[PDB]
Design a protein around this nucleic acid. Structure first.
Ligand code: ZN
Lengths: 55, 134, 80
RNA sequence: GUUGGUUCUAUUUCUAGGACCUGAUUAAUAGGGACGGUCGGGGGCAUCAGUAUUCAAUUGUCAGAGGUGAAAUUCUUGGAUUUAUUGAAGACUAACUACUGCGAAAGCAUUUGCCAAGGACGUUUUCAUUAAUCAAGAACGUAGGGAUCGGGUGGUGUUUUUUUA
């Protein structure tokens, strides 16, 4: 289970850093619309669910 | 004393990104004023939300003019109204705790500032003379 | 230092204060924001001074600050 | 730029003319006003805290103890001074405290809450000379540079974090 959760953390931090970099790199729309984003937010799913919860 | 002011632009055929008409602006203005909004607040609300630059340059006439022109005008000017109700609030506070001589000094200054534009408004006669502090 | 008191460089005109230029102007700017509930456009000021609410999907769009009003975290804007 | 009545219409559609039922430059790096996020030992009221000081109580141990330039004087075997545990009282906000902040000036430092006020900044908000200065009176007792405080804008690294605001 050492190597198991070693591999689990080693893929989790990879996809996590990938998700956060994809969030706050640059989001222009199909047209010109730069997306407002937080200083230290992490997921498009996160900002999607919080814009759902502020319905 | 320093400067803190807006600088309205050199343009006067404003603003060429304005898709909206010039009648819905007057409609929104009379909507907000019969909602009970003072000239400053109706100006700032349709500046931000239904984005105008200023209504004096989108419509051909200032908002006090169009409020009088749609029969919705104030009975005292906005500045005298706000300064009067500030005077009655500081008087109510000093009436509550009468030891506040700083509020006494500020009330003297507020009443003098009332009298300034009060006698100005009597000399121009927007609200009629015999008028002294409601 | 020593400046041409007529029409100066634009690098200095965008540097000095908006009153102190030779012809004064604004520095706020209007911008189209997409409210993320129902995707439709509304204009908004920059120094917006009040909480605009896009009446179609009436969530919130920007809360005001002392200067430029920050936008609400899912919004998307076009400067214009 | 809010009622009633008249006549003209062809395949009830749908129609044309009367009366009668609130004014006009610009928006100063002149001004006052609104609004936003603030900011301050600015003010008033209420509240909280601190350990000193004074006093009281409970002890414990024994010839001295405040005070003085010495002395003198003061109190001390009815145990003082000192020690420990509490309690009361009102006063005050040390170190933090600066060539920093606020107030028209004098002045202004504990916490929290409330009451209002004020500054500056921001602003493509509004009004349009509303300003300036003191009799009289009123309330209170030369340019440049480096920093730093308050606000704003932009940059892009670290502290920061992440679907609760
Ligand atoms: Zn929507």
């Amino acid at each position: 289970l050492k190597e198991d959760i070693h591999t689990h953390m080693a893929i989790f931090e990879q996809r996590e850093a990938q998700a956060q970099e994809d969030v706050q790199s640059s989001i222009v729309d199909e047209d010109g619309f730069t997306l407002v984003v937080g200083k230290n937010t992490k997921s498009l799913n996160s900002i999607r669910k919080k814009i759902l919860n502020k319905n | 004393k320093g400067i803190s002011s807006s600088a309205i632009p050199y343009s006067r055929n404003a603003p060429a990104w304005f898709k909206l008409s010039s009648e819905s602006v007057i409609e929104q203005i009379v909507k907000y004023a019969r909602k009970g909004l003072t000239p400053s607040q109706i100006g700032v609300l349709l500046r931000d939300a239904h984005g105008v630059t200023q209504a004096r340059v989108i419509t051909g006439n200032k908002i006090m003019r169009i409020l009088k022109s749609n029969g919705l005008a104030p009975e005292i000017p906005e500045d005298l109204y706000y300064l009067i109700k500030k005077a009655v609030s500081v008087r109510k506070h000093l009436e509550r705790n009468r030891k506040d001589k700083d509020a006494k000094f500020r009330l003297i200054l507020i009443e003098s500032r009332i009298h300034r534009l009060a006698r100005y408004y009597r000399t121009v006669a927007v609200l009629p003379p015999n008028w002294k502090y409601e | 230092l020593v400046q041409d008191l007529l029409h100066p460089t634009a690098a200095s005109e965008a540097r000095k204060h908006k009153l102190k230029t030779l012809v004064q102007g604004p520095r706020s700017y209007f911008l189209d924001v997409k409210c993320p509930g129902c995707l439709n456009i509304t204009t908004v000021f920059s120094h917006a001074q009040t909480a605009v609410t896009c009446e179609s999907c009436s969530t919130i769009l920007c809360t005001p600050t002392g200067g430029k009003a920050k936008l609400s975290e899912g919004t998307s804007f076009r400067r214009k």
